[PDB]
């Protein structure tokens, strides 16, 4: 996260760290959506142009974390993956269309002050909140600059941007399964997700029921926090039918 701030304790209790078993390193962010299911970006797991294709046994999920590198004894919980599910029409060849994947855990994680699932939006919350100008919140342990590595989880609030401004900011083909967020150059404030923040949640707090909903997944960007560029997020609601099919078929 660029130009964000340190998280408060317990501020994002659905934040998941995807961790590589060997060499031991952060691979991506992710989110907890129930005691056995974790949501991330497909590109976190599969991206053939970069020779990336992880299998279940390659990874761990670390939940309840705050510190990036420390083992947070008696607080974090480390979980093994039962199975990975990638969207069958995830477009790694062109533009990361439908950049979404689910991971089922081997055993259910215990909820705590630091571990708690986020909600997924239904059609009305999405219709109500996913509007240009409305702000969401992105969290992660990714780079602090385009070209560290924070000591602890970082957070930044960013406004959703109008789809024509999203489209006009890039040469990549944008789809309805994506949205973009960030400040415009004349708006003064800055902030963005960056490498390492991949797969983490873009959340909004509904003013109707005061619950946090995951509206996006950190997906892609050109550089980080550049003027006239925006971060792109997978549109969780548009892919929710796939999400529910997987959990309904596989548990």
């Amino acid at each position: 996260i660029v130009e964000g701030s340190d998280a408060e304790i317990g501020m994002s209790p659905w934040q998941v760290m995807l961790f590589r078993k060997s060499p031991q390193e952060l691979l991506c962010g992710a989110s907890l959506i129930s005691d056995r299911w974790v949501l991330t970006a497909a590109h976190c797991l599969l991206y053939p142009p970069w020779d990336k294709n992880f299998t279940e046994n390659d990874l761990l999920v670390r939940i309840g974390k705050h510190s990036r590198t420390r083992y947070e004894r008696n607080i974090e919980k480390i979980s093994m993956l039962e199975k990975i599910y990638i969207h069958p029409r995830y477009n790694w060849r062109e533009n990361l269309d439908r950049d979404i994947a689910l991971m089922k855990l081997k055993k259910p994680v215990a909820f705590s002050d630091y571990i708690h699932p986020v909600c997924l939006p239904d059609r009305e919350t999405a219709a109500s909140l996913l509007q240009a100008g409305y702000k969401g919140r992105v969290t992660g342990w990714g780079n602090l600059k385009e070209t560290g590595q924070p000591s602890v989880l970082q957070v930044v609030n960013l406004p959703i941007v109008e789809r024509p401004v999203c489209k006009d900011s890039t040469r990549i083909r944008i789809t309805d399964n994506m949205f973009c967020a960030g400040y415009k150059p004349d708006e003064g404030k800055r902030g963005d997700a960056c490498e390492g923040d991949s797969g983490g949640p873009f959340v909004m707090k509904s003013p109707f029921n005061n619950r946090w909903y995951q509206m996006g997944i950190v997906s892609w960007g050109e550089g980080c926090d550049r003027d006239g560029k925006y971060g792109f997020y997978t549109h969780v609601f548009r892919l929710k039918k796939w999400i529910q099919k997987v959990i309904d078929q596989f548990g």
Binding site: S5, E8, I9, G10, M11, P13, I33, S34, D35, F111, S112, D113, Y114, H116, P117, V118, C119, L120, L129, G133, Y134, K135, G136, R137, V155, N157, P159, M204, K205, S206, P207, N210, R211, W212, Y213
Partner: peptide, 29 residues
């Protein structure tokens, strides 16, 4: 989950975090 999206250290004990009001203020009017 029935309890999803309600944080134990914030919503569940009626505490607000330091910047959530920035989001509320953007959900206009």
């Amino acid at each position: 989950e029935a309890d999803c999206g309600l944080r134990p250290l914030f919503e569940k004990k009626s505490l607000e975090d330091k910047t959530e009001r920035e989001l509320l203020e953007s959900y206009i009017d």
